[PDB]
Amino acid sequence: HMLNVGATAPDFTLRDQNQQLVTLRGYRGAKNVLLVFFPLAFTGICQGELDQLRDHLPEFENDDSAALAISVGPPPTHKIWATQSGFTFPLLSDFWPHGAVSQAYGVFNEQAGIANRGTFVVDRSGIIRFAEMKQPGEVRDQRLWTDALAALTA
Amino acid sequence: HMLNVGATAPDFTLRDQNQQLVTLRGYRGAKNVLLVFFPLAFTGICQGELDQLRDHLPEFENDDSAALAISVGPPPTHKIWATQSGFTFPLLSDFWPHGAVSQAYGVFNEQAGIANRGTFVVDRSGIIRFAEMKQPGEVRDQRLWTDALAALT
């Protein structure tokens, strides 16, 4: 099942949309990390969620916080989507092995082969301090994300 | 790994870019099928190959022949690419299980998690009658596809 608050966040090294390696442990001791798992690029609900993250980026990518969007797509998919959508934050490929990081966080839909709408905040110690999992057909409330992030600055 | 000529073509049922199910077996007795495997949507060499196919579509999609392009990408990826590129032929998703059909045809790159640039012609009996895979630099020779197809009518 989904990892809950108090668990150590599984570490990972994934390619971003520009093929650079991004590792979760690299933020430890420096920033709180918002992990935004999403099902599929070029779909309507995903578009809306990541458009909203784009529109409010300074709340998620600053001196205290970092945001990483994760899905099973490979980098060329995430690159074209990011370019066409104006996304400048990292989109990470859980592509091969397929959904392995999703599976480690307990947010992989084993029937569909896609991550659910899982969201986590990982504190500077690497412990999960916010956890949620919505289904692909549901929409998340991003005020919950900013509120969790805010509580780990002060 | 690649299946050679004379082998029975593994049957599949995959979603196309509009989420419709396409099954190889449905062409048996009716059409020769060209199977164009490709690594990734939105890449350069894939683009050029499938653009050639678009530009020559009546040679590949007619009363005697059908063409199916196959990669590991899911339908929304294929839908956006297809729409942007004018691909009106089926792009099929070997997505989940990841590359299972590609594996069955012996054209899966296990290290990278993508299909290689393999091509097959399947006759009206379901037998592989043409099998092609080019070097990493090299774009496939589509006159060859139309020649193989032409030999089977």
Numbering used by the authors:
A (entry chain B): 0 to 153
B (entry chain A): 0 to 152
Provide the publication's sentences verbatim.
The crystal structure of AhpE shows 2 dimers per asymmetric unit, which are denoted chains A and B17. Accordingly, we decided to use both chains in our analysis, because the cysteine environment in each is distinctly different. In chain A, the side chain of the conserved arginine residue (Arg116) is oriented away from the cysteine and directed outwards to the flexible β9-α5 loop, whilst in chain B it is turned inwards to the active site cysteine. To improve protein stability during MD simulations, we realized that a re-refinement of the models of the AhpE structure was needed (see supplementary). After this re-refinement operation, we repeated the simulation with the newly refined structure for chain A and found that after 30 ns the helix α2 remained intact. Importantly, a gauche minus conformation was found for the peroxydatic Cys45 in the active site of chain A after re-refinement, which is in line with the conformation reported for most of peroxiredoxins. In chain A with Cys45 modeled as a thiolate, the sulfur has four direct H-bonds, while in chain B five H-bonds were found. In the active site of chain B, most H-bonding interactions are intra-protein, involving the side chains of Thr45, Arg116, and the backbone amide of Cys45. In the case of chain A, however, the H-bonding network is much more dependent on water molecules, which, in their mobility, provide a less stable H-bonding environment. Beyond that, our results confirm that chain B, where the conserved Arg116 is located in the surroundings of Cys45 active site, is the reactive conformation for H2O2 reduction.
We assessed the performance of these methods in the identification of sulfur hydrogen bonds within the active site of the enzyme Alkyl hydroperoxide reductase E (AhpE) from Mycobacterium tuberculosis. To test our approach on structural coordinated atoms in space, we used the active site environment of the peroxidatic sulfur of peroxiredoxin AhpE, a single cysteine enzyme. AhpE reduces H2O2 to water but no H2O2 is present in the active site of the AhpE structures. Method 3, however, only finds the interaction with the water molecule, not the Arg116. It is predicted that stabilization of the Cys45 thiolate by Arg116 will promote its nucleophilic character, so that this Cys represents a catalytically active state of the enzyme.
